[PDB]
Amino acid sequence: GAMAQNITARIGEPLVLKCKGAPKKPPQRLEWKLNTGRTEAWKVLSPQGGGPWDSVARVLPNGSLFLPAVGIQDEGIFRCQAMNRNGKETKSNYRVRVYQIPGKPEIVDSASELTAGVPNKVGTCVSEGSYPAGTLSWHLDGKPLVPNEKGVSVKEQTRRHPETGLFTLQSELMVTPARGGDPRPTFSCSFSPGLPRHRALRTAPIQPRVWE
Amino acid sequence: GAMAQNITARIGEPLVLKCKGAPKKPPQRLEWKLNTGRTEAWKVLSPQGGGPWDSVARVLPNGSLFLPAVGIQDEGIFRCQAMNRNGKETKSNYRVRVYQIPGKPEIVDSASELTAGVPNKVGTCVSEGSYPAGTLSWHLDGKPLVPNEKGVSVKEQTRRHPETGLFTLQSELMVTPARGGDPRPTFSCSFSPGLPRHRALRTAPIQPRVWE
Amino acid sequence: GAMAQNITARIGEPLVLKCKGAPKKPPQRLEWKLNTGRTEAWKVLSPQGGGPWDSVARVLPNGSLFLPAVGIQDEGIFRCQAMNRNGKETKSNYRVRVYQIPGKPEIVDSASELTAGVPNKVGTCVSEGSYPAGTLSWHLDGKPLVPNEKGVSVKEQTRRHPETGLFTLQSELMVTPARGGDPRPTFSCSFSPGLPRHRALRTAPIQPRVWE
Amino acid sequence: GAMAQNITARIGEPLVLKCKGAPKKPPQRLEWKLNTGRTEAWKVLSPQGGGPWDSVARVLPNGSLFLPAVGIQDEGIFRCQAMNRNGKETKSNYRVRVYQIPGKPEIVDSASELTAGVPNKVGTCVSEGSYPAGTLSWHLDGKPLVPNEKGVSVKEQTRRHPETGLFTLQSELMVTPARGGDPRPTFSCSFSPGLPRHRALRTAPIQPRVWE
Ligand SMILES: O=C(O)c1ccc(Oc2cccc(COCc3cccc(-c4c(C(=O)O)[nH]c5ccccc45)c3)c2)cc1
Ligand SMILES: O=C(O)c1ccc(Oc2cccc(COCc3cccc(-c4c(C(=O)O)[nH]c5ccccc45)c3)c2)cc1
Ligand SMILES: O=C(O)c1ccc(Oc2cccc(COCc3cccc(-c4c(C(=O)O)[nH]c5ccccc45)c3)c2)cc1
Ligand SMILES: O=C(O)c1ccc(Oc2cccc(COCc3cccc(-c4c(C(=O)O)[nH]c5ccccc45)c3)c2)cc1
Ligand SMILES: [Cl-]
Ligand SMILES: [Cl-]
Ligand SMILES: [Cl-]
Ligand SMILES: [Cl-]
């Protein structure tokens, strides 16, 4: 595509996109074009508006585009072209990526006892309500646990909510504790969002006892 | 995929899918699995049900799967596996395709006069509310008009309704009437649905005058 | 999207798309833009060309766009904008749909004997190498057989070739012949292409004997 | 879906997937099922093999599935079900995600001089050949530069190679240096891969002079 400003828009929240170079109030020679999950290729939106799109995305008096409650299908590309009073044309190009933050992750079915030297089910981490899916990972006394690297194995599952489309992730951790290791290790799980610079969420720790 | 019974389901209407081989009433050893636009790969549904899926697809007392109002995202694959009283297992496999019938097509902006030997805009045919999109085509005195043959040109547009996802099609017809041809030709447009054996819908005819 | 000329392009064959309004030979102020399965949104192509796109789609001396061998990923939208010597701008807008014709369909595993009044497997129809998938249907002495309508049942399967992406369809027909019906009925299967105005392909007939 | 082992497979490299529980050498009662970009829903593969799938994914003597050179279309789900000599059934479930590492990112068109208190184009960062796309980000003397905070603006572009499908990313950085700040700042750009635990790649730094 072309060079664009990246926009991250939280699902359910409003979004205002500026039409650069447009006069401050009507009359305005401007046009918006959008290609999103709602459209077949480009759809043109005008200041006069009208029709079913008025419920979804409307041009404001200052020429900006307004979406009262972003959904997953609004992901896509949004462009404006405007002429100012002098006649200079100005383009605006946005790439809109949508997201939702899940609830704090939880560990369910955690083991209270582990036996050293054999595989043990440690627990299952669950995160509900993300978009995009994101990922879950495990930590042992503050360091990342890497699957298939040192007696660690992980299985993962993804589900979607049938109406909202948001993701539920589950991750089951198994470990073989090394003989002579720490008798009260501390495990946690973290949710890492898909989009850049979004913060991780962490579970409360679990601390089983390890039998030599 | 595997061999399946093809199911066509109209958007907004209920759908009942039989679980072959299941006992007539509970208790029943059966399981449904579905992979549709709502799911991440296979989702399992059980007679006990529960959760947000109960609003979308529920197992009935006789083991059939019930969807009270099909939508576009229910397109996909639906399977049941059941054991009867004797313990014989029976599989059911369905491929569900969704559709909606548009309103009767209309001709807008029709020409009242055509000039023979030059290109003329005849009209624009519009169909609103189909799924899958389907196609529009033109006819002249009962015979198909083929684009790019014998002085015929057509341009087409597709749009989607931003909330329902249903398609609006437009088709603009241009013709160059042959000199010495019929002075009062009859044009019509037809909507052809995407799915097999669904009937076409036809516009009222238009009858311009042709000037030699 | 916008109004476009519909283009149907056979997979593996070249495609030339005209840039309306461009000068006949260089120098030319024109630009092509395409959004297809190969692109992230719009890709711009220029008369000078260069790079990996030269292998796929190149501007010719007369300003037309040339694809030496269309593939499935070239489905999409192709646009040109040109200025003539006078400075008039002209736009060209194409919607390109790709297709391939399968081999003639065949009936395999046909029954030689049918018993009236009970269900019988009649045969399996197979079509290899279509795009888009298309559909198979059955006929009995020249009339369409409708699934689930009169002791007729059909099961269907779709597969894709792992390298070419082309579709193989299979359709298994079962019938319960009516008592006192024709002792030597004639069944056939037809392949119906997905795109408009493309011709159907038909199998050779089978003529089992029916036992009263 | 169901619980699965996550597999990350580099494009162009072989992949071997174990069929847990299968006998060590033929004869073996096992079956693989896969649903990937190459398939229409589930495709079954058997030890005997045959056909065009042998070029893509083949069962080995020990029952493992072998792909000699993974591509983007092999992303998906791979499952085995086997019986051992005793008759115990074992399932294996894999979710295969594909990737490619781009070349080291580069800064092009870097500014040698910046003026404090006004916006300045700093440079354009380019990364070629990733899958999934990944993202680019900028740093100033070792700290992340956040777009739209403290006089920082970024624009981004994504393109795909027309034959390989791999992504090229570009990111253009603009900054307004604060008056009285460091006269010789150090900027760099980093590529962050899409998949978890893959390492970032960093450009060589640039050090323009800032004029008060
Ligand atoms: O006299 C009057 O009453 C009157 C006159 C004009 C008018 O409205 C316009 C005023 C200026 C220009 C345009 C024409 O611009 C369309 C457009 C609208 C969105 C985006 C783009 C666009 C395109 C592209 O589509 O080519 N590429 C891009 C790349 C990056 C960013 C944007 C684009 C173009 C329309 C209204 C009323
Ligand atoms: O004791 C109890 O209380 C109790 C016992 C069992 C039970 O429920 C089942 C009763 C019989 C068998 C199965 C196990 O079948 C799962 C399945 C469910 C849907 C579809 C399929 C399926 C698969 C596949 O997934 O392999 N392939 C197919 C191809 C074509 C058609 C269907 C399939 C399999 C579950 C409930 C309660
Ligand atoms: O001086 C020189 O050396 C020199 C000058 C110009 C030049 O090349 C051009 C000559 C005329 C106009 C344009 C600018 O047009 C871009 C474009 C290219 C494809 C398609 C479209 C397009 C858009 C849209 O993108 O807005 N919408 C559409 C709707 C329907 C059909 C097409 C479009 C626009 C570029 C080369 C050299
Ligand atoms: O006598 C002989 O010569 C002979 C006998 C059997 C034979 O091969 C099989 C040996 C055991 C079982 C099965 C039947 O299993 C199919 C299957 C194959 C892949 C995956 C799955 C599967 C399903 C599912 O599809 O239901 N769900 C899952 C969830 C997680 C993991 C896997 C699955 C099922 C086939 C070959 C030869
Ligand atoms: Cl799901
Ligand atoms: Cl639209
Ligand atoms: Cl397949
Ligand atoms: Cl691109």
PDB file of N, CA and C in Angstrom, chain B residues 114-190:
ATOM      1  N   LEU B 114     -32.961   6.086 -28.353  1.00  0.00           N
ATOM      2  CA  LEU B 114     -31.644   5.605 -28.751  1.00  0.00           C
ATOM      3  C   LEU B 114     -31.409   6.037 -30.192  1.00  0.00           C
ATOM      4  N   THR B 115     -30.153   6.299 -30.535  1.00  0.00           N
ATOM      5  CA  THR B 115     -29.771   6.636 -31.900  1.00  0.00           C
ATOM      6  C   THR B 115     -29.005   5.463 -32.488  1.00  0.00           C
ATOM      7  N   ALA B 116     -29.457   4.956 -33.632  1.00  0.00           N
ATOM      8  CA  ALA B 116     -28.784   3.809 -34.237  1.00  0.00           C
ATOM      9  C   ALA B 116     -27.393   4.189 -34.725  1.00  0.00           C
ATOM     10  N   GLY B 117     -26.464   3.229 -34.635  1.00  0.00           N
ATOM     11  CA  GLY B 117     -25.137   3.432 -35.177  1.00  0.00           C
ATOM     12  C   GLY B 117     -24.151   4.141 -34.271  1.00  0.00           C
ATOM     13  N   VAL B 118     -24.569   4.566 -33.086  1.00  0.00           N
ATOM     14  CA  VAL B 118     -23.675   5.184 -32.109  1.00  0.00           C
ATOM     15  C   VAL B 118     -23.919   4.523 -30.757  1.00  0.00           C
ATOM     16  N   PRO B 119     -22.998   4.679 -29.806  1.00  0.00           N
ATOM     17  CA  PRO B 119     -23.239   4.075 -28.489  1.00  0.00           C
ATOM     18  C   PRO B 119     -24.267   4.890 -27.737  1.00  0.00           C
ATOM     19  N   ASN B 120     -25.094   4.193 -26.961  1.00  0.00           N
ATOM     20  CA  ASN B 120     -26.157   4.791 -26.165  1.00  0.00           C
ATOM     21  C   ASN B 120     -26.188   4.125 -24.806  1.00  0.00           C
ATOM     22  N   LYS B 121     -26.350   4.910 -23.734  1.00  0.00           N
ATOM     23  CA  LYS B 121     -26.641   4.376 -22.417  1.00  0.00           C
ATOM     24  C   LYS B 121     -28.097   3.924 -22.369  1.00  0.00           C
ATOM     25  N   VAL B 122     -28.335   2.639 -22.160  1.00  0.00           N
ATOM     26  CA  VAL B 122     -29.693   2.092 -22.143  1.00  0.00           C
ATOM     27  C   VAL B 122     -30.322   2.224 -20.770  1.00  0.00           C
ATOM     28  N   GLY B 123     -29.587   1.893 -19.721  1.00  0.00           N
ATOM     29  CA  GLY B 123     -30.143   1.935 -18.388  1.00  0.00           C
ATOM     30  C   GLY B 123     -29.161   1.350 -17.400  1.00  0.00           C
ATOM     31  N   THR B 124     -29.567   1.413 -16.126  1.00  0.00           N
ATOM     32  CA  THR B 124     -28.798   0.844 -15.030  1.00  0.00           C
ATOM     33  C   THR B 124     -29.698  -0.098 -14.242  1.00  0.00           C
ATOM     34  N   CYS B 125     -29.284  -1.353 -14.099  1.00  0.00           N
ATOM     35  CA  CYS B 125     -30.063  -2.330 -13.346  1.00  0.00           C
ATOM     36  C   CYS B 125     -29.492  -2.423 -11.937  1.00  0.00           C
ATOM     37  N   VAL B 126     -30.374  -2.464 -10.932  1.00  0.00           N
ATOM     38  CA  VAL B 126     -29.976  -2.519  -9.515  1.00  0.00           C
ATOM     39  C   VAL B 126     -30.710  -3.637  -8.796  1.00  0.00           C
ATOM     40  N   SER B 127     -29.944  -4.418  -8.031  1.00  0.00           N
ATOM     41  CA  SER B 127     -30.482  -5.466  -7.173  1.00  0.00           C
ATOM     42  C   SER B 127     -29.951  -5.262  -5.768  1.00  0.00           C
ATOM     43  N   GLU B 128     -30.833  -5.264  -4.762  1.00  0.00           N
ATOM     44  CA  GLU B 128     -30.378  -5.005  -3.383  1.00  0.00           C
ATOM     45  C   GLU B 128     -30.712  -6.160  -2.453  1.00  0.00           C
ATOM     46  N   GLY B 129     -29.723  -6.608  -1.688  1.00  0.00           N
ATOM     47  CA  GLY B 129     -29.966  -7.525  -0.589  1.00  0.00           C
ATOM     48  C   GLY B 129     -29.671  -8.991  -0.847  1.00  0.00           C
ATOM     49  N   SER B 130     -28.736  -9.334  -1.726  1.00  0.00           N
ATOM     50  CA  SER B 130     -28.451 -10.760  -1.975  1.00  0.00           C
ATOM     51  C   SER B 130     -27.294 -11.298  -1.128  1.00  0.00           C
ATOM     52  N   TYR B 131     -27.302 -12.633  -0.930  1.00  0.00           N
ATOM     53  CA  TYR B 131     -26.109 -13.349  -0.488  1.00  0.00           C
ATOM     54  C   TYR B 131     -26.212 -14.760  -1.056  1.00  0.00           C
ATOM     55  N   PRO B 132     -25.143 -15.325  -1.644  1.00  0.00           N
ATOM     56  CA  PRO B 132     -23.913 -14.634  -2.052  1.00  0.00           C
ATOM     57  C   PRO B 132     -24.256 -13.597  -3.085  1.00  0.00           C
ATOM     58  N   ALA B 133     -23.233 -12.905  -3.592  1.00  0.00           N
ATOM     59  CA  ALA B 133     -23.559 -11.725  -4.406  1.00  0.00           C
ATOM     60  C   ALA B 133     -24.520 -12.026  -5.576  1.00  0.00           C
ATOM     61  N   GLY B 134     -24.256 -13.099  -6.357  1.00  0.00           N
ATOM     62  CA  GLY B 134     -25.026 -13.301  -7.567  1.00  0.00           C
ATOM     63  C   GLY B 134     -24.543 -12.348  -8.650  1.00  0.00           C
ATOM     64  N   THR B 135     -25.270 -12.358  -9.763  1.00  0.00           N
ATOM     65  CA  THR B 135     -24.840 -11.530 -10.919  1.00  0.00           C
ATOM     66  C   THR B 135     -26.061 -10.951 -11.609  1.00  0.00           C
ATOM     67  N   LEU B 136     -25.869  -9.841 -12.349  1.00  0.00           N
ATOM     68  CA  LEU B 136     -26.903  -9.243 -13.196  1.00  0.00           C
ATOM     69  C   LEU B 136     -26.562  -9.456 -14.672  1.00  0.00           C
ATOM     70  N   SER B 137     -27.588  -9.639 -15.491  1.00  0.00           N
ATOM     71  CA  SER B 137     -27.360  -9.774 -16.919  1.00  0.00           C
ATOM     72  C   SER B 137     -28.507  -9.108 -17.664  1.00  0.00           C
ATOM     73  N   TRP B 138     -28.257  -8.783 -18.936  1.00  0.00           N
ATOM     74  CA  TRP B 138     -29.220  -8.053 -19.750  1.00  0.00           C
ATOM     75  C   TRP B 138     -29.734  -8.922 -20.896  1.00  0.00           C
ATOM     76  N   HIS B 139     -30.962  -8.641 -21.327  1.00  0.00           N
ATOM     77  CA  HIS B 139     -31.601  -9.328 -22.434  1.00  0.00           C
ATOM     78  C   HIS B 139     -32.246  -8.323 -23.378  1.00  0.00           C
ATOM     79  N   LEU B 140     -32.250  -8.696 -24.650  1.00  0.00           N
ATOM     80  CA  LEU B 140     -32.856  -7.895 -25.705  1.00  0.00           C
ATOM     81  C   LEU B 140     -33.818  -8.804 -26.451  1.00  0.00           C
ATOM     82  N   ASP B 141     -35.093  -8.419 -26.453  1.00  0.00           N
ATOM     83  CA  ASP B 141     -36.221  -9.184 -26.995  1.00  0.00           C
ATOM     84  C   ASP B 141     -36.063 -10.682 -26.746  1.00  0.00           C
ATOM     85  N   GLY B 142     -35.835 -11.017 -25.479  1.00  0.00           N
ATOM     86  CA  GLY B 142     -35.784 -12.390 -25.038  1.00  0.00           C
ATOM     87  C   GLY B 142     -34.488 -13.119 -25.286  1.00  0.00           C
ATOM     88  N   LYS B 143     -33.462 -12.455 -25.782  1.00  0.00           N
ATOM     89  CA  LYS B 143     -32.221 -13.195 -25.920  1.00  0.00           C
ATOM     90  C   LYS B 143     -31.142 -12.543 -25.072  1.00  0.00           C
ATOM     91  N   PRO B 144     -30.217 -13.323 -24.532  1.00  0.00           N
ATOM     92  CA  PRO B 144     -29.121 -12.755 -23.742  1.00  0.00           C
ATOM     93  C   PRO B 144     -28.289 -11.777 -24.558  1.00  0.00           C
ATOM     94  N   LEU B 145     -27.983 -10.637 -23.952  1.00  0.00           N
ATOM     95  CA  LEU B 145     -27.010  -9.703 -24.486  1.00  0.00           C
ATOM     96  C   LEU B 145     -25.649 -10.052 -23.919  1.00  0.00           C
ATOM     97  N   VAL B 146     -24.676 -10.317 -24.778  1.00  0.00           N
ATOM     98  CA  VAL B 146     -23.357 -10.731 -24.301  1.00  0.00           C
ATOM     99  C   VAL B 146     -22.425  -9.523 -24.331  1.00  0.00           C
ATOM    100  N   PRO B 147     -21.796  -9.154 -23.220  1.00  0.00           N
ATOM    101  CA  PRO B 147     -20.855  -8.025 -23.259  1.00  0.00           C
ATOM    102  C   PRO B 147     -19.701  -8.237 -24.239  1.00  0.00           C
ATOM    103  N   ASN B 148     -19.301  -7.130 -24.854  1.00  0.00           N
ATOM    104  CA  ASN B 148     -18.221  -7.012 -25.835  1.00  0.00           C
ATOM    105  C   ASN B 148     -18.503  -7.745 -27.152  1.00  0.00           C
ATOM    106  N   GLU B 149     -19.748  -8.134 -27.409  1.00  0.00           N
ATOM    107  CA  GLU B 149     -20.147  -8.698 -28.692  1.00  0.00           C
ATOM    108  C   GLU B 149     -21.207  -7.804 -29.313  1.00  0.00           C
ATOM    109  N   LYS B 150     -21.067  -7.527 -30.604  1.00  0.00           N
ATOM    110  CA  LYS B 150     -22.089  -6.811 -31.372  1.00  0.00           C
ATOM    111  C   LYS B 150     -22.471  -5.456 -30.769  1.00  0.00           C
ATOM    112  N   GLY B 151     -21.478  -4.611 -30.476  1.00  0.00           N
ATOM    113  CA  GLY B 151     -21.782  -3.270 -29.974  1.00  0.00           C
ATOM    114  C   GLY B 151     -22.429  -3.185 -28.597  1.00  0.00           C
ATOM    115  N   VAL B 152     -22.144  -4.110 -27.716  1.00  0.00           N
ATOM    116  CA  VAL B 152     -22.694  -4.110 -26.363  1.00  0.00           C
ATOM    117  C   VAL B 152     -21.551  -3.880 -25.390  1.00  0.00           C
ATOM    118  N   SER B 153     -21.718  -2.958 -24.456  1.00  0.00           N
ATOM    119  CA  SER B 153     -20.764  -2.754 -23.368  1.00  0.00           C
ATOM    120  C   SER B 153     -21.494  -2.757 -22.029  1.00  0.00           C
ATOM    121  N   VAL B 154     -20.890  -3.322 -20.992  1.00  0.00           N
ATOM    122  CA  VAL B 154     -21.492  -3.322 -19.677  1.00  0.00           C
ATOM    123  C   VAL B 154     -20.440  -2.933 -18.661  1.00  0.00           C
ATOM    124  N   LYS B 155     -20.849  -2.159 -17.675  1.00  0.00           N
ATOM    125  CA  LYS B 155     -20.027  -1.899 -16.501  1.00  0.00           C
ATOM    126  C   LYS B 155     -20.786  -2.322 -15.257  1.00  0.00           C
ATOM    127  N   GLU B 156     -20.052  -2.822 -14.236  1.00  0.00           N
ATOM    128  CA  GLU B 156     -20.655  -3.412 -13.056  1.00  0.00           C
ATOM    129  C   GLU B 156     -20.050  -2.843 -11.788  1.00  0.00           C
ATOM    130  N   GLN B 157     -20.863  -2.798 -10.769  1.00  0.00           N
ATOM    131  CA  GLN B 157     -20.471  -2.365  -9.426  1.00  0.00           C
ATOM    132  C   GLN B 157     -21.087  -3.260  -8.356  1.00  0.00           C
ATOM    133  N   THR B 158     -20.309  -3.542  -7.300  1.00  0.00           N
ATOM    134  CA  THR B 158     -20.782  -4.272  -6.133  1.00  0.00           C
ATOM    135  C   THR B 158     -20.506  -3.470  -4.864  1.00  0.00           C
ATOM    136  N   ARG B 159     -21.517  -3.413  -3.996  1.00  0.00           N
ATOM    137  CA  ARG B 159     -21.402  -2.783  -2.675  1.00  0.00           C
ATOM    138  C   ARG B 159     -21.986  -3.711  -1.634  1.00  0.00           C
ATOM    139  N   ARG B 160     -21.553  -3.550  -0.364  1.00  0.00           N
ATOM    140  CA  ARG B 160     -22.144  -4.307   0.731  1.00  0.00           C
ATOM    141  C   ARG B 160     -22.788  -3.399   1.755  1.00  0.00           C
ATOM    142  N   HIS B 161     -23.904  -3.870   2.315  1.00  0.00           N
ATOM    143  CA  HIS B 161     -24.542  -3.113   3.384  1.00  0.00           C
ATOM    144  C   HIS B 161     -23.636  -3.177   4.604  1.00  0.00           C
ATOM    145  N   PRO B 162     -23.355  -2.066   5.263  1.00  0.00           N
ATOM    146  CA  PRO B 162     -22.321  -2.050   6.294  1.00  0.00           C
ATOM    147  C   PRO B 162     -22.656  -2.849   7.539  1.00  0.00           C
ATOM    148  N   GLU B 163     -23.941  -3.112   7.810  1.00  0.00           N
ATOM    149  CA  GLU B 163     -24.298  -3.899   8.984  1.00  0.00           C
ATOM    150  C   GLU B 163     -24.716  -5.312   8.633  1.00  0.00           C
ATOM    151  N   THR B 164     -25.467  -5.493   7.552  1.00  0.00           N
ATOM    152  CA  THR B 164     -25.936  -6.863   7.270  1.00  0.00           C
ATOM    153  C   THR B 164     -25.023  -7.645   6.394  1.00  0.00           C
ATOM    154  N   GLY B 165     -24.096  -7.002   5.666  1.00  0.00           N
ATOM    155  CA  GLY B 165     -23.230  -7.759   4.790  1.00  0.00           C
ATOM    156  C   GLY B 165     -23.843  -8.135   3.466  1.00  0.00           C
ATOM    157  N   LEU B 166     -25.116  -7.809   3.242  1.00  0.00           N
ATOM    158  CA  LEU B 166     -25.767  -8.232   1.994  1.00  0.00           C
ATOM    159  C   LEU B 166     -25.316  -7.346   0.830  1.00  0.00           C
ATOM    160  N   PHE B 167     -25.370  -7.904  -0.371  1.00  0.00           N
ATOM    161  CA  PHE B 167     -24.827  -7.247  -1.570  1.00  0.00           C
ATOM    162  C   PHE B 167     -25.865  -6.452  -2.350  1.00  0.00           C
ATOM    163  N   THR B 168     -25.441  -5.278  -2.836  1.00  0.00           N
ATOM    164  CA  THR B 168     -26.168  -4.517  -3.839  1.00  0.00           C
ATOM    165  C   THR B 168     -25.333  -4.505  -5.109  1.00  0.00           C
ATOM    166  N   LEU B 169     -25.947  -4.935  -6.222  1.00  0.00           N
ATOM    167  CA  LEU B 169     -25.285  -4.989  -7.531  1.00  0.00           C
ATOM    168  C   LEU B 169     -25.876  -3.917  -8.430  1.00  0.00           C
ATOM    169  N   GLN B 170     -25.030  -3.299  -9.246  1.00  0.00           N
ATOM    170  CA  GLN B 170     -25.492  -2.406 -10.302  1.00  0.00           C
ATOM    171  C   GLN B 170     -24.808  -2.765 -11.606  1.00  0.00           C
ATOM    172  N   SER B 171     -25.560  -2.666 -12.703  1.00  0.00           N
ATOM    173  CA  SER B 171     -25.055  -3.000 -14.031  1.00  0.00           C
ATOM    174  C   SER B 171     -25.561  -1.940 -14.995  1.00  0.00           C
ATOM    175  N   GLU B 172     -24.637  -1.259 -15.689  1.00  0.00           N
ATOM    176  CA  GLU B 172     -24.955  -0.214 -16.670  1.00  0.00           C
ATOM    177  C   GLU B 172     -24.736  -0.766 -18.063  1.00  0.00           C
ATOM    178  N   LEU B 173     -25.786  -0.716 -18.886  1.00  0.00           N
ATOM    179  CA  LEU B 173     -25.757  -1.255 -20.234  1.00  0.00           C
ATOM    180  C   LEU B 173     -25.615  -0.144 -21.244  1.00  0.00           C
ATOM    181  N   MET B 174     -24.693  -0.314 -22.210  1.00  0.00           N
ATOM    182  CA  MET B 174     -24.596   0.529 -23.406  1.00  0.00           C
ATOM    183  C   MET B 174     -24.721  -0.339 -24.641  1.00  0.00           C
ATOM    184  N   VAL B 175     -25.453   0.150 -25.639  1.00  0.00           N
ATOM    185  CA  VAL B 175     -25.583  -0.550 -26.912  1.00  0.00           C
ATOM    186  C   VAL B 175     -25.427   0.428 -28.073  1.00  0.00           C
ATOM    187  N   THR B 176     -24.891  -0.104 -29.180  1.00  0.00           N
ATOM    188  CA  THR B 176     -24.928   0.558 -30.486  1.00  0.00           C
ATOM    189  C   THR B 176     -25.937  -0.184 -31.354  1.00  0.00           C
ATOM    190  N   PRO B 177     -27.170   0.322 -31.523  1.00  0.00           N
ATOM    191  CA  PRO B 177     -28.156  -0.392 -32.346  1.00  0.00           C
ATOM    192  C   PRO B 177     -27.696  -0.464 -33.782  1.00  0.00           C
ATOM    193  N   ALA B 178     -27.884  -1.629 -34.392  1.00  0.00           N
ATOM    194  CA  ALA B 178     -27.587  -1.768 -35.810  1.00  0.00           C
ATOM    195  C   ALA B 178     -28.556  -0.951 -36.660  1.00  0.00           C
ATOM    196  N   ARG B 179     -28.019  -0.295 -37.686  1.00  0.00           N
ATOM    197  CA  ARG B 179     -28.864   0.462 -38.601  1.00  0.00           C
ATOM    198  C   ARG B 179     -29.904  -0.443 -39.254  1.00  0.00           C
ATOM    199  N   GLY B 180     -31.109   0.095 -39.422  1.00  0.00           N
ATOM    200  CA  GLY B 180     -32.209  -0.666 -39.976  1.00  0.00           C
ATOM    201  C   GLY B 180     -32.769  -1.752 -39.086  1.00  0.00           C
ATOM    202  N   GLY B 181     -32.510  -1.709 -37.777  1.00  0.00           N
ATOM    203  CA  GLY B 181     -33.014  -2.709 -36.856  1.00  0.00           C
ATOM    204  C   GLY B 181     -34.404  -2.366 -36.349  1.00  0.00           C
ATOM    205  N   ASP B 182     -34.811  -3.054 -35.283  1.00  0.00           N
ATOM    206  CA  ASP B 182     -36.178  -2.879 -34.774  1.00  0.00           C
ATOM    207  C   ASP B 182     -36.332  -1.492 -34.142  1.00  0.00           C
ATOM    208  N   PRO B 183     -37.347  -0.710 -34.528  1.00  0.00           N
ATOM    209  CA  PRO B 183     -37.485   0.641 -33.947  1.00  0.00           C
ATOM    210  C   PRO B 183     -37.949   0.665 -32.501  1.00  0.00           C
ATOM    211  N   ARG B 184     -38.515  -0.420 -31.977  1.00  0.00           N
ATOM    212  CA  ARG B 184     -38.995  -0.456 -30.597  1.00  0.00           C
ATOM    213  C   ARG B 184     -38.479  -1.713 -29.897  1.00  0.00           C
ATOM    214  N   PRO B 185     -37.171  -1.792 -29.624  1.00  0.00           N
ATOM    215  CA  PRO B 185     -36.621  -2.980 -28.946  1.00  0.00           C
ATOM    216  C   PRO B 185     -37.089  -3.053 -27.506  1.00  0.00           C
ATOM    217  N   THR B 186     -36.973  -4.251 -26.920  1.00  0.00           N
ATOM    218  CA  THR B 186     -37.369  -4.482 -25.535  1.00  0.00           C
ATOM    219  C   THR B 186     -36.177  -5.030 -24.765  1.00  0.00           C
ATOM    220  N   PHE B 187     -35.750  -4.302 -23.740  1.00  0.00           N
ATOM    221  CA  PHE B 187     -34.631  -4.702 -22.907  1.00  0.00           C
ATOM    222  C   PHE B 187     -35.141  -5.094 -21.534  1.00  0.00           C
ATOM    223  N   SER B 188     -34.471  -6.077 -20.916  1.00  0.00           N
ATOM    224  CA  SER B 188     -34.731  -6.375 -19.506  1.00  0.00           C
ATOM    225  C   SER B 188     -33.429  -6.779 -18.840  1.00  0.00           C
ATOM    226  N   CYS B 189     -33.443  -6.807 -17.508  1.00  0.00           N
ATOM    227  CA  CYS B 189     -32.305  -7.262 -16.733  1.00  0.00           C
ATOM    228  C   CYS B 189     -32.772  -8.354 -15.792  1.00  0.00           C
ATOM    229  N   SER B 190     -31.891  -9.309 -15.522  1.00  0.00           N
ATOM    230  CA  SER B 190     -32.192 -10.425 -14.626  1.00  0.00           C
ATOM    231  C   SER B 190     -31.116 -10.550 -13.564  1.00  0.00           C
TER     232      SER B 190
END
